[PDB]
Design a protein around this ligand. Sequence first.
Ligand SMILES: Nc1ncnc2c1ncn2[C@@H]1O[C@H](COP(=O)(O)OP(=O)(O)OP(O)(O)=S)[C@@H](O)[C@H]1O
Ligand SMILES: Nc1ncnc2c1ncn2[C@@H]1O[C@H](COP(=O)(O)OP(=O)(O)OP(O)(O)=S)[C@@H](O)[C@H]1O
Ligand SMILES: Nc1ncnc2c1ncn2[C@@H]1O[C@H](COP(=O)(O)OP(=O)(O)OP(O)(O)=S)[C@@H](O)[C@H]1O
Ligand SMILES: Nc1ncnc2c1ncn2[C@@H]1O[C@H](COP(=O)(O)OP(=O)(O)OP(O)(O)=S)[C@@H](O)[C@H]1O
Lengths: 624, 174, 48, 58, 163
Amino acid sequence: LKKYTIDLTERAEQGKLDPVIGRDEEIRRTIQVLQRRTKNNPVLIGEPGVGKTAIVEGLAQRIINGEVPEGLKGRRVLALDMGALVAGAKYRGEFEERLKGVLNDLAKQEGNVILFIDALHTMAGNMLKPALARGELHCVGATTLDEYRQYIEKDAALERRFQKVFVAEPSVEDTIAILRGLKERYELHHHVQITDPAIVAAATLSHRYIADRQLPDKAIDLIDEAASSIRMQIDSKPEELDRLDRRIIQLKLEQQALMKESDEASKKRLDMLNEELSDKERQYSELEEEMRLLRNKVTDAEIAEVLARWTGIPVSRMMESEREKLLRMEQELHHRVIGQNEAVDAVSNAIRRSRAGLADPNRPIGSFLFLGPTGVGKTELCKALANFMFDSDEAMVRIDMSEFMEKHSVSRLVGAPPGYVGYEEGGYLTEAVRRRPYSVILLDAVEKAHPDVFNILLQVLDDGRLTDGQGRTVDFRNTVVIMTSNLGVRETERKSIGLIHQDNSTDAMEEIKKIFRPEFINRIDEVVVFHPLGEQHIASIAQIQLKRLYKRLEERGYEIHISDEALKLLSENGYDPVYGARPLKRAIQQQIENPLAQQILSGELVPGKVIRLEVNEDRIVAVQ
Amino acid sequence: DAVSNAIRRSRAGLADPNRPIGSFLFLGPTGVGKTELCKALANFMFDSDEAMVRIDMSEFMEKHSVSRLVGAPPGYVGYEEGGYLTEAVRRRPYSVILLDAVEKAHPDVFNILLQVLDDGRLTDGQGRTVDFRNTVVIMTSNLGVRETERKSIGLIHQDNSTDAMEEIKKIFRP
Amino acid sequence: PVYGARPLKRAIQQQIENPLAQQILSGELVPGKVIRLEVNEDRIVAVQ
Amino acid sequence: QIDSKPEELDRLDRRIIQLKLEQQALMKESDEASKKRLDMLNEELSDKERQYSELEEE
Amino acid sequence: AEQGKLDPVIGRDEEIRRTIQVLQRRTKNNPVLIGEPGVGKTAIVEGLAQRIINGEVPEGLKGRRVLALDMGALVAGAKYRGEFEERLKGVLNDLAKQEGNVILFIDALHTMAGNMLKPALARGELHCVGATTLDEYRQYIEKDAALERRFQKVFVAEPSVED
Ligand SMILES: Nc1ncnc2c1ncn2[C@@H]1O[C@H](COP(=O)(O)OP(=O)(O)OP(O)(O)=S)[C@@H](O)[C@H]1O
Ligand SMILES: Nc1ncnc2c1ncn2[C@@H]1O[C@H](COP(=O)(O)OP(=O)(O)OP(O)(O)=S)[C@@H](O)[C@H]1O
Ligand SMILES: Nc1ncnc2c1ncn2[C@@H]1O[C@H](COP(=O)(O)OP(=O)(O)OP(O)(O)=S)[C@@H](O)[C@H]1O
Ligand SMILES: Nc1ncnc2c1ncn2[C@@H]1O[C@H](COP(=O)(O)OP(=O)(O)OP(O)(O)=S)[C@@H](O)[C@H]1O
């Protein structure tokens, strides 16, 4: 008891055990087990982070703090932790000897020293049952759910040794009382003065967002991380000084990339960045020679910037300048997708209300069932939205739902039942959107998937979470979906002419209301129906079809200027009454790119010189 | 009044001990607020929507989904991880369970469900007994929406009951 | 008749709350005061 | 229950220990005009002290 | 690193501020670099060592020095029941002798026993550095809320042209 044990009451005497304000219920549950003769060893069972070790050591905090009544005063808490019994016994038999020594010690305590097994799955059993049979061992269990059950559940002799402990959960109120009850201990443990908004945002926002740990402790280590980044601010220089100096370090690593060259002077095209280097010396000198350089407002906005680096709705963007690209979000789509006014306003306004957040957080954000014709370019619009917000097309997780015809379809895409290859491989959308849950959940042709797939669209559209075969919640409460499904193609291509719009809504709503409930008609953002294009739109997609060719042949170092007559021939070959604007790239390549390749390989086009496409033909030809 | 009188019967004590406490079949058009009322049922007596999980019978249609509700056969992943029904009831047997669209489930969940109803004992992949004899279940349906919203004009309630009980009759027992 | 008062969630958030979000985040509406649902013209507009 | 303080007595004493150590949390705040709302927990604490004094006497 | 035998880095300041900013905690205290074996995360912990030792770092990481428990001498002679145990308790007590002025960059973080590592990481008595592959940080474990209270990660994405 003097060699192997750690005195938890002494830990609560000096105060290395962080004081626990509240929860008298389960410490009273411990004391109620301690008066109990049989089933005398309590087992603290919660999730990890219900504080099982901290409830035994806080039971020592009660035994020193006198909140315990008569009966246990004198019965001493001494904790056999792991690591203690692992002494230099290189040979056998001495283990049973030293255990016989310490069980003669608690055998002569006679209810004066209480034993404790920290992380109960450690310790034995061949010797504690006599010491739990006379009345001489008084041990305590504190370990997790899996480590108590797999410690032992099913021995009816050892569950005769161990009683479990179960809890009750009130509101976020007493979590706020944990955070204010601990915030000055982490002032003198975290070098600050904890104002309230960081911890009340930690409590309420922890009860809203975090689906991995539990109240209040997820808020507690959020304040740990918070005061960590705060002391990162405390011991460094003031703010904009570190803006200047840190961008000096990283950007001089960029010029460190941008100096070791073949010819240094000609590719010093970054000369503005070096005048800006001496300018960073200039304003960085203004602010080194020269609060709002301080934050006791920790802040909710700034650990909302940390959590905003986590989730997928930012607030670090919120203190930036964003309204100028918001007010021409239509026109910044018109740089690559022109026309379709109720589509760019219904879709773009649906993006505004979506990432603005006007619905339930326990509802999805941008929820779209697309229904309409072809000849439009849906995946290039999905690339316009990943290349719009995601700034390039990583989010385009394209998972075709066409494969799913037989009985076992939700074992296919949801994930297989365990005990097989398919569960560890998981489902299709379940896994490839399990990697990025807060992203574009892009789907083509969902209608051929199961009714069960339809009602788990009713799960990610009502609830906004997903469940595989095992039974956990993949969180979708912070993602925008795009469903470029192939529901519309035959109905909306076949509807012209002879079928009015209410009839396509009638039989398409006979498919939806054939399987879905009214919330699939209702709870999407918009039913976005497209229309065919005009001639100036053909001119615009010619221009932006050329801008990619400008940057592409720009990487080689050539120049091409095109007259208006070739524009007139492409406008002539642009539109057909049956198909629309799709074969334009094929006509451009078949009439333009054949003599261009023929003369760039033939030798008639000279490198290092400007190229111009003229017409010494009845079609487009190349010349120098 | 139906669910509230079911609560007064629940805390009152009328029930047969070889039965579940509450079991109902809801039919009709959709738009009434079923699982919002189940969120109020998670709000009233044990006081928390944290204790509302909402369970579905749709994804569980396969050859091994019987071993999803009972746990896998031995020698499998999900045998040591168990099943959703056996672990879920085995943690706290006195709780509120929210099922959806049981027609999606097989006649093997209807016979495990019969063991919820009759004689009160479920044997899993392993085979040990499962305590179901004081458990409250809630099961919603799509039989109401898929033949009521179009037949709301003209049809009567008895014929609604019969043309539910036909496809029920093909795949359930009385 | 089939649908009921179910779409009224998005009749509110869609039908009024899109220009309301435009006017709140536009900077016209300074926060901090008691809101009275005023009447501009025949489509519902909230004014601060 | 006979050796120590009675059941309704330590229900009450432990409700007032919930509210009192809840105030030991609830002292240091951020701004006054928002988070000194807790008037209602104070009059509930008056029910706590009065009922605990009543069954303290009885 | 004083002798300068290690590999340099180019750029790498924002997400290594994510590495230092995930270093200086108490429990969750240890960073994890995420990514496959063709990205270079050991250059990020050793460029971390070059910021700590060379001196662009502010106050706090001036004197900190990094050690490395490896599995090789752990499994070298495990002849009897206790050799590996006397040697690992020697590791933990030598962690106690430099008193937390030992940084322990454990690469292959799941390799390092553990119930003797958990409470010292919990009190503040232990503080290390972790590293595991993208798929293998999906394999490490995140739902053990205890081992959620022992470690934390650093985010790195798909590489670009300019870098
Ligand atoms: N009210 C509180 N007062 C003080 N510290 C608290 C409080 N709530 C949580 N903690 C912290 O909770 C942390 C975890 O407690 P533990 O003693 O590890 O209990 P535990 O859940 O059994 O951990 P194990 O045994 O490793 S599973 C400690 O580091 C405490 O700082
Ligand atoms: N606006 C556009 N800009 C650039 N390329 C386009 C455009 N529209 C179509 N394309 C090209 O033509 C192809 C067809 O466009 P998509 O965006 O895939 O149309 P789609 O309806 O999504 O076809 P799916 O996905 O096979 S049903 C694209 O992959 C591009 O190569
Ligand atoms: N009348 C209503 N009152 C309140 N909330 C409603 C109502 N109707 C729908 N909801 C919301 O929409 C969700 C689904 O609608 P429900 O009324 O529960 O019908 P349902 O049959 O449960 O559909 P589910 O939940 O997808 S199986 C609920 O969880 C609520 O969030
Ligand atoms: N950041 C870097 N800076 C400098 N050289 C690097 C860098 N990353 C990789 N290298 C080079 O690549 C070689 C090995 O790359 P590693 O850094 O070991 O890749 P890795 O991601 O660490 O994968 P491991 O270590 O095999 S798991 C080194 O010998 C260097 O030549």
